[PDB]
Amino acid sequence: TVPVALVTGAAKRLGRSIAEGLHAEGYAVCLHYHRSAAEANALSATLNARRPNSAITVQADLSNVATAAPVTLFTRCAELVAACYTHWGRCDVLVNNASSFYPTPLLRREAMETATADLFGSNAIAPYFLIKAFAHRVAGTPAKHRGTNYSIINMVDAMTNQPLLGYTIYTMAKGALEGLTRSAALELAPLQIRVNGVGPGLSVLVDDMPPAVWEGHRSKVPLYQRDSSAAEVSDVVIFLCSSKAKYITGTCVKVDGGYSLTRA
Amino acid sequence: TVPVALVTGAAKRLGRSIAEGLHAEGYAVCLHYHRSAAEANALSATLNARRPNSAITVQADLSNVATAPAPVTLFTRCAELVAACYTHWGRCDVLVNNASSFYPTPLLREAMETATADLFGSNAIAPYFLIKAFAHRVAGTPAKHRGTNYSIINMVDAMTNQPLLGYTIYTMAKGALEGLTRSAALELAPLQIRVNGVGPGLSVLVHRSKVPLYQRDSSAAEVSDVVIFLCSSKAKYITGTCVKVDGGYSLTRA
Amino acid sequence: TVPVALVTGAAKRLGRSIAEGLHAEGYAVCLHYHRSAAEANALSATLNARRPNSAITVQADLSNVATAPAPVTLFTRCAELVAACYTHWGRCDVLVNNASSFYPTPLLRAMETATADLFGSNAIAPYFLIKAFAHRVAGTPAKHRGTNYSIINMVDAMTNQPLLGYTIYTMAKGALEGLTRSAALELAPLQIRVNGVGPGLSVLVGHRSKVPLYQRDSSAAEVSDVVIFLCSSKAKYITGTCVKVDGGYSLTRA
Amino acid sequence: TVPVALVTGAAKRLGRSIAEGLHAEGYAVCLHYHRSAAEANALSATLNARRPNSAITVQADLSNVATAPAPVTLFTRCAELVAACYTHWGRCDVLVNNASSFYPTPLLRREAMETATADLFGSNAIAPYFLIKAFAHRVAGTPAKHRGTNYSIINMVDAMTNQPLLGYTIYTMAKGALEGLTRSAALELAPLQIRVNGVGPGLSVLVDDMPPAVWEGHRSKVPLYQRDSSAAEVSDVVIFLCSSKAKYITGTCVKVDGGYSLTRA
Ligand SMILES: NC(=O)C1=CN([C@@H]2O[C@H](COP(=O)(O)OP(=O)(O)OC[C@H]3O[C@@H](n4cnc5c(N)ncnc54)[C@H](OP(=O)(O)O)[C@@H]3O)[C@@H](O)[C@H]2O)C=CC1
Ligand SMILES: NC(=O)C1=CN([C@@H]2O[C@H](COP(=O)(O)OP(=O)(O)OC[C@H]3O[C@@H](n4cnc5c(N)ncnc54)[C@H](OP(=O)(O)O)[C@@H]3O)[C@@H](O)[C@H]2O)C=CC1
Ligand SMILES: NC(=O)C1=CN([C@@H]2O[C@H](COP(=O)(O)OP(=O)(O)OC[C@H]3O[C@@H](n4cnc5c(N)ncnc54)[C@H](OP(=O)(O)O)[C@@H]3O)[C@@H](O)[C@H]2O)C=CC1
Ligand SMILES: NC(=O)C1=CN([C@@H]2O[C@H](COP(=O)(O)OP(=O)(O)OC[C@H]3O[C@@H](n4cnc5c(N)ncnc54)[C@H](OP(=O)(O)O)[C@@H]3O)[C@@H](O)[C@H]2O)C=CC1
Ligand SMILES: O=C1C[C@H](c2cccc(O)c2)Oc2ccc(O)cc21
Ligand SMILES: O=C1C[C@H](c2cccc(O)c2)Oc2ccc(O)cc21
Hints:
Four copies of one chain form a homotetramer. By secondary structure, chain A is α/β, with parallel strands linked by helices. Chain A has helices spanning 13-24, 37-50, 73-88, 110-140, 168-188, 211-218, 231-241, and strands spanning 4-7, 28-33, 55-59, 93-96, 150-155, 193-200, 252-255. Chain A has a single domain (1-264), classed as NAD(P)-binding Rossmann-like Domain (Rossmann fold). Chain A binds chain D through residues 64, 72, 74, 105-108, 112-113, 116, 120, 124-125, 128, 131-132, 135-136, 139, 160-161, 163, 165-169, 171-180, 182-184, 186-188, 191, and chain D through 64, 73, 75, 106-110, 113-114, 117, 121, 125-126, 129, 132-133, 136-137, 140, 161-162, 164, 166-170, 172-181, 183-185, 187-189, 192.
């Protein structure tokens, strides 16, 4: 009876805020996490206190590596979607929010091979496997039992067309996610599964450098001269998931305060 | 108090849907029309019946020509539209450049100078002047009296990168409008005036089967709700961007 | 047999360099100018001293206004520019829309002049010129047509990251981008290719140090070689595309 | 001073045409191949007979998998391709990322699924990344006074992936990463004067393994000429972007598609 959202990397920051925004609209939310077990369970607790049985947590490394028979990434992704159907009997919304982000400079061991798998798995390959698994489930549901508003959001990046110096794999991974948005929107249109991108510029900018540098980097955003709040992104995601957005598919909405209109 | 929306080409179809959407959020709406006085006045009557003094109508040709009363330029008519809002309600918070002529200007086989003025005016030049007048008024308001949510929406087209055969001047003017959205967003950022695009693909046709999502054109609400969302405070960090509302039509190839 | 190129704003800088490059490939070149009569003529003389009957000059204001004889409209002026190629050499194979005014049209604190000047030269004159060029080609019987028709529109690599205060200009280049796409689709049956070239910083008169490649603006040749390549028979499958020549400048962000 | 070009998937079609067009301009060419040994060796023989010792061949699976010797990583096989150029001719001026696998990965109906991902993503995106890395390291490790004057990297992307081909998601995704690679490497390698550009074909030398009406149906949709392109119609563009006349063009994509991307259903 109640719609279901699967949110990857739901524990903190934009993931938490998306999970909360959907929750506030009456979704039950499956809270995916990798490292951040404590933050995910705290968030689950808060949502379940607000509305009983409105949240669960599931752990998964979305790197394109086999784990713990070794278990593939595809399996782990299928298992994420399956947790939604096991617990609540449905999965209506998928938000591919989880994402690794760190330098892979082109100009100078097993940190190389783990980087590619981590940055590609989380940003691109796992989203592919998630969308596929989400779609198989919809396909397998008799039409009379289908949800009436299936929506998938990929968090891409407003700024990867002006690439961040030294972040090539990340930039390529987000490039791939963009492709996913356009290819899945096309192929899944027959099943009325909408697929769209949301692309933050500077959002909840990590405070881990001198204040002058942090204030320097925010002040470049033309609108407000700051990085966004998490809700300023997440509200956009909740709007794209809503029935008022039911004719939107295959598009990317930039949420960047005009940062992409800038030049050096 | 009550925020105000100026919606051009408000009388019918998407413009009417946008004016209705905005009015449902609590906006007073100034309903611009050109030829559709009957339809624009009936819409005003409906909205004023729902909420007293919540709509007005104003007439202007948005073509890039002079009109008689010294002849009146496009720029002056555009300033007078924005002014009409200020005169009547003391504010103009939202501007929706919706009015648009759309007809063939083929490259292959006099009043081709009519097309230029008409297609280029409504779609690109009048929006530029409207944005300019809009911004002047905000800049002219002492900061402590300014609203908190200035929003300009340009109605562009999802399909203009895959041009409609024979619609060159229309296609060009949409390309001009997209440039207006980016340049205005950047220059108006310091006054907190957001500027975004909404591109319909196929909407309320008066080829439907080619749209990946649903194999139909959209309702007017399917577009105008997106407009309303972009104007709301939840969309306050969005500027300079363009939202396609095309059911995936731009993903297709012949 | 000798093909003909018409180059707008051919007197100096990129226009000159494109005209030279075309000429170097053996084109007869029609050198359009507005105010630079001395430089156009001096260029013509050099190219005529190299090969007789290989260069002419034609004056035209490309602003979207009427001029002195009924008055002469921009359409007539554009058609006559193309007629000059046919009158003198019996053909027009290549059109380069290079002429371009460029100056501030600020949104925040003569408006008619900016509008006519920046839109005409950048967008409407290219439209009329493309239309005249194409009409000629269509009116030539098939057996007598050239085998390599090329239109190049000079656009701007940086207009997605707009220059602050230059709205009408940025809109006009966006209109020209749309002209590239719409004309390439419509003119493909007559095998008229239409492409853009987007210079970034070129032959400046301190943004230069920000260009990732070489930390300088380009030379004129650095751009015009691209234009020559796109007109060559090696580029015969390219149409409706835009080539940035900007040393990676459009890759940057504040 | 004979400049050198590495061309991945050089044995046939567009790769071979690119390897020829570079050879014709005076390049020594290292012709990479995977399963097409015989075609590659044939083309090498042809170009060596025009100009002795101006072609070699190297074999590598560019799939993102470890191979038969410790196992050998994709990263290593990629470094080894750029190495072959230095070992044999002392330089590598031009890299063309052309190798590409292309087949469907439908979202709608499983050692097939693993192998597709590693192959499609390896060939179209991750191999180019490592090739670029290796090519740049060499340039960085060459003392400035000995560096060539015209380094150029071309990635063969696709004019049409913004209008995706139904059922080819991993391919489309890989091409999207490859576009990212162009933009990112152009910016980062700009200080070494290493230009990085994309060339995006539309319908080029279209394989005829459907009924004639299907082939002719496809081709007829191309606005310019109502045909697919020759290999040369793409490779000439590659050659131009590598030439010294293109020395200010970096981080850009050139579509070679006869207007196909302008169309709508
Ligand atoms: N903040 C910003 O300005 C920008 C954000 N974005 C994008 O928006 C989205 C949300 O942004 P933000 O909240 O800042 O993202 P974060 O960087 O905070 O990452 C969110 C989560 O992704 C999860 N994650 C990372 N790697 C893996 C992995 N290998 N497997 C599983 N989970 C993983 C982490 O989970 P856990 O903590 O449980 O380990 C982390 O909490 C991301 O996709 C990001 O790329 C894009 C541009 C700018
Ligand atoms: N519907 C669709 O499928 C699509 C729509 N769009 C865009 O969406 C917007 C709204 O679409 P739609 O509702 O179909 O538009 P319409 O074609 O119905 O036009 C809306 C109004 O614009 C006004 N108008 C036209 N020319 C002039 C002029 N010279 N001066 C002043 N007003 C003028 C007319 O007002 P009046 O009746 O008062 O004279 C008209 O009712 C437009 O900007 C359009 O470009 C884009 C792509 C597809
Ligand atoms: N150089 C650069 O950095 C950049 C250039 N570009 C584009 O590249 C092209 C060439 O650049 P560049 O050589 O610098 O151009 P210029 O600014 O030097 O101008 C070129 C010529 O345009 C002609 N022109 C201007 N206005 C009119 C008018 N109303 N009617 C007729 N002709 C007119 C002038 O002719 P006359 O002198 O005879 O009066 C002028 O010499 C242009 O389209 C430009 O917008 C784009 C981005 C950057
Ligand atoms: N032709 C067209 O219409 C289009 C082409 N393109 C792009 O242009 C480029 C060239 O096109 P085209 O000539 O048709 O290419 P092909 O599809 O013929 O493939 C090119 C070569 O790539 C090699 N290859 C494939 N998978 C691998 C792998 N895992 N490892 C190593 N090598 C591999 C093959 O080498 P071998 O034979 O040695 O095994 C093959 O000969 C490609 O990158 C393609 O994606 C893009 C859009 C349309
Ligand atoms: O009525 C339409 C549909 C029309 C349309 C019709 C058919 C195909 C297509 O891409 C677009 O687009 C319009 C553009 C501007 C406008 O003011 C009205 C319309
Ligand atoms: O001379 C220039 C440089 C100039 C310029 C200067 C500085 C930044 C930038 O993006 C562009 O751009 C032009 C645009 C049109 C034109 O006719 C000439 C120029």
